[PDB]
Amino acid sequence: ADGVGSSSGNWHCDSTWLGDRVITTSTRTWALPTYNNHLYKQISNGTSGGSTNDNTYFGYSTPWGYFDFNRFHCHFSPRDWQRLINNNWGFRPKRLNFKLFNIQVKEVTQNEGTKTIANNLTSTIQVFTDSEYQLPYVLGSAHQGCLPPFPADVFMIPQYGYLTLNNGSQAVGRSSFYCLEYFPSQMLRTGNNFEFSYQFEDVPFHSSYAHSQSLDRLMNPLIDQYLYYLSRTQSTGGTAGTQQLLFSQAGPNNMSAQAKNWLPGPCYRQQRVSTTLSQNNNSNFAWTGATKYHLNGRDSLVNPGVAMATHKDDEERFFPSSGVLMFGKQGAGKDNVDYSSVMLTSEEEIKTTNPVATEQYGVVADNLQQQNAAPIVGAVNSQGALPGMVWQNRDVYLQGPIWAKIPHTDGNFHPSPLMGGFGLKHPPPQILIKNTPVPADPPTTFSQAKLASFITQYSTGQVSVEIEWELQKENSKRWNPEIQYTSNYYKSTNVDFAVNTDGTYSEPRPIGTRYLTRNL
Amino acid sequence: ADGVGSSSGNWHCDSTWLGDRVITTSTRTWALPTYNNHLYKQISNGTSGGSTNDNTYFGYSTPWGYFDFNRFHCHFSPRDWQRLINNNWGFRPKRLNFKLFNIQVKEVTQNEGTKTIANNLTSTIQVFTDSEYQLPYVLGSAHQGCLPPFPADVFMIPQYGYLTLNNGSQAVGRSSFYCLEYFPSQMLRTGNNFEFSYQFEDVPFHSSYAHSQSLDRLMNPLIDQYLYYLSRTQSTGGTAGTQQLLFSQAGPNNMSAQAKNWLPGPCYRQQRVSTTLSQNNNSNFAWTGATKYHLNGRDSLVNPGVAMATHKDDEERFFPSSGVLMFGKQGAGKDNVDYSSVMLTSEEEIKTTNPVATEQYGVVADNLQQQNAAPIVGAVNSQGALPGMVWQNRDVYLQGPIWAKIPHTDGNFHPSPLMGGFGLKHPPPQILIKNTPVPADPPTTFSQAKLASFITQYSTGQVSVEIEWELQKENSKRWNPEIQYTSNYYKSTNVDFAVNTDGTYSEPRPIGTRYLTRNL
Amino acid sequence: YAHSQSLDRLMNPLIDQYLYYLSRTQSTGGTAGTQQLLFSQAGPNNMSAQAKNWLPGPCYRQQRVSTTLSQNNNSNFAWTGATKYHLNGRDSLVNPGVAMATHKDDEERFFPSSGVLMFGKQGAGKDNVDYSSVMLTSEEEIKTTNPVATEQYGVVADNLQQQNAAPIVGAVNSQGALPGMVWQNRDVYLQGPIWAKIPHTDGNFHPS
Amino acid sequence: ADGVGSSSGNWHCDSTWLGDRVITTSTRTWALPTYNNHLYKQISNGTSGGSTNDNTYFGYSTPWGYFDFNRFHCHFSPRDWQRLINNNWGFRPKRLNFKLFNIQ
Nearest residue in chain B measured CA to CA from A24: B182
Nearest to A87 among D77, D79, D87 (CB): D87
Cβ <8 Å between D79 and A484 = no
Q: What DSSP string runs through B345-410?
A: ----GGGTTS-BTTS-SEEEE-S---SSSPP-EEEESEE---TTB---PPPPBTTSB-EEEPP--S
Mutate which of B364, B409, B416 to disrupt the C interface (most C C-beta within 10 Å)? B409
The answer to whether the beta carbons of residues C111 and C67 sit under 8 Å apart is yes
D25–A contact, CB cutoff 8 A: no
A113–D contact, CB cutoff 8 A: no
D71–C contact, CB cutoff 8 A: yes
Interface A:B, Cβ pairs < 8 A: 167
- Omega before C96 cis (within 30°)? yes
Bind-site residues of A for beta-D-galactose: 55
Give the Å distances, CA to CA, from B405 to B199, C42, C63: 15, 21, 35
Give the Å distances, CA to CA, from A199 to A205, A424, A426, B127, B397: 16, 11, 10, 32, 59
- Please check if B111 is assigned to a binding site: no
Cα A288 from Cα B11, distance rounded (Å): 77
Query: Reduced to 3 states, what is the DSSP secondary structure of residue D83?
Result: helix
Positive/negative CA dihedral, B35, B41, B42, B48? negative
Cβ <8 Å between D72 and C195 = no
Nearest residue in chain C measured CA to CA from D87: C1
Judging contacts by C-beta atoms under 8 Å, the chain D residues touching residue A482 are 79, 82
B25–C contact, CB cutoff 8 A: no
Cα A252 from Cα B60, distance rounded (Å): 60
Q: Which residues of A2-143 form beta strands (DSSP E)?
A: 14-18, 21-32, 41-45, 57-67, 88-111, 114-119, 125-129
* Nearest residue to D6 via CA among D102, D86, D72: D102
Distance from CA of D10 to the nearest CA of A (A): 19
Judging contacts by C-beta atoms under 8 Å, the chain A residues touching residue D82 are 481-482, 484
Distance from CA of B9 to the nearest CA of A (A): 15
CA angle, C101 as apex, C96 and C104 as ends, to 5°? 140
A484–D contact, CB cutoff 8 A: yes
Mutate which of A482, A484, A485, A517 to disrupt the D interface (most D C-beta within 10 Å)? A482
Contacting chains of A (3 CB pairs or more, <8 Å) are: B, D
Cβ <8 Å between C14 and B415 = no
Query: Reduced to 3 states, what is the DSSP secondary structure of residue B318?
Result: strand
The answer to whether the beta carbons of residues B288 and C24 sit under 8 Å apart is no
The answer to whether the beta carbons of residues C89 and C130 sit under 8 Å apart is no
Q: What DSSP string runs through A414-470?
A: S---TTSSEEESS-PPPEEEEEPP-BPPPPSS---SPP--B--EEEEEEEEEEEEEE
Q: Which of residues 220-279 of B touch C (CB under 8 A)?
A: 265-266, 268-273, 275, 277-279
Nearest residue in chain A measured CA to CA from D15: A477
Cα B150 from Cα A471, distance rounded (Å): 56
Cα B91 from Cα B206, distance rounded (Å): 6
Interrupted backbone of chain A, residues before each interruption (C–N > 2.5 Å) = none
Residue type, D21: R
Distance from CA of B6 to the nearest CA of A (A): 10
Nearest residue in chain B measured CA to CA from C159: B271
- Omega before A304 cis (within 30°)? yes
Residue type, A335: D
Judging contacts by C-beta atoms under 8 Å, the chain A residues touching residue D79 are 476, 478-482
D16–A contact, CB cutoff 8 A: no
Distance from CA of B169 to the nearest CA of C (A): 12
What are the helix (H) ranges across C14-156? none
Task: Show Cβ contacts of residue B154 under 8 Å, excluding neighbours closer than 6 positions.
Answer: B28, B29, B30, B31, B460
Task: Show Cβ contacts of residue A10 under 8 Å, excluding neighbours closer than 6 positions.
Answer: B184, B185, B186, B187
Q: Could you count the other beta carbons within 10 Å of the beta carbon of residue B434?
A: 27
Torsion on CA atoms A329, A333, A335, A339, rounded to nearest 10: -40
Q: What DSSP string runs through A299-310?
A: EEE--S-S--BS
Cβ <8 Å between C189 and D70 = no
Distance from CA of A83 to the nearest CA of D (A): 8
What are the helix (H) ranges across B271-320? none
Nearest to A108 among B36, B124, B441 (CB): B441
Q: Which of residues 35-54 of B touch C (CB under 8 A)?
A: 43, 45, 51-52, 54
D8–A contact, CB cutoff 8 A: no
The answer to whether the beta carbons of residues A81 and B74 sit under 8 Å apart is no
Judging contacts by C-beta atoms under 8 Å, the chain A residues touching residue D86 are 86, 484
Judging contacts by C-beta atoms under 8 Å, the chain D residues touching residue A83 are 87
Cα B104 from Cα B32, distance rounded (Å): 10
Distance from CA of A19 to the nearest CA of D (A): 8
Resolution (A): 2.8
Cα B287 from Cα B485, distance rounded (Å): 36
User: Exposed, middle or buried: residue A52 (CB in 10 Å: 0-12, 13-18, 19+)?
Assistant: exposed
Cβ <8 Å between C193 and D89 = no
A480–D contact, CB cutoff 8 A: yes
CA angle, B28 as apex, B23 and B34 as ends, to 5°? 135
Angle between helix A78-87 and helix D78-87 axes, rounded to 10 deg: 160
Cα C180 from Cα C54, distance rounded (Å): 5
Cβ <8 Å between B296 and C101 = yes
Cβ <8 Å between B438 and A460 = yes
Mutate which of C85, C190, C197 to disrupt the D interface (most D C-beta within 10 Å)? C190
Cα A48 from Cα B488, distance rounded (Å): 97
Task: Show Cβ contacts of residue C172 under 8 Å, excluding neighbours closer than 6 positions.
Answer: B381, B382, C59, C152, C153, C154, C155, C156
B192–A contact, CB cutoff 8 A: yes
A116–B contact, CB cutoff 8 A: yes
A479–D contact, CB cutoff 8 A: yes
Cα B163 from Cα B136, distance rounded (Å): 8
Give the Å distances, CA to CA, from D38 to A217, B332, D32, D58: 55, 85, 13, 20
User: Exposed, middle or buried: residue C204 (CB in 10 Å: 0-12, 13-18, 19+)?
Assistant: exposed
Per the DSSP assignment, residues forming a β-bridge with B18 are B21
Judging contacts by C-beta atoms under 8 Å, the chain D residues touching residue C193 are 70-72
Q: Which residues of C1-153 form beta strands (DSSP E)?
A: 20-26, 35-41, 59-60, 64-66, 84-87, 90-93, 110-112, 118-120, 134-136
Interface A:D, Cβ pairs < 8 A: 19
Give the pairing type, strands B154-156 and B21-32: parallel
Half-sphere exposure of B240 (CA within 13 A, CB side): 3
Burial per residue of A474-504, b for 16 or more beta-carbon CB atoms within 10 angstroms, e otherwise: beeebeeebeeeebeeebeebbbbbbeeebb
The values of phi and psi at residue A72, to 5°, are -60, -45
Q: Could you count the other beta carbons within 10 Å of the beta carbon of residue B12?
A: 13
Query: Reduced to 3 states, what is the DSSP secondary structure of residue A145?
Result: coil
A122–B contact, CB cutoff 8 A: no
The answer to whether the beta carbons of residues C191 and D71 sit under 8 Å apart is yes
A478–D contact, CB cutoff 8 A: yes
D104–C contact, CB cutoff 8 A: no
Cβ <8 Å between A158 and B446 = yes
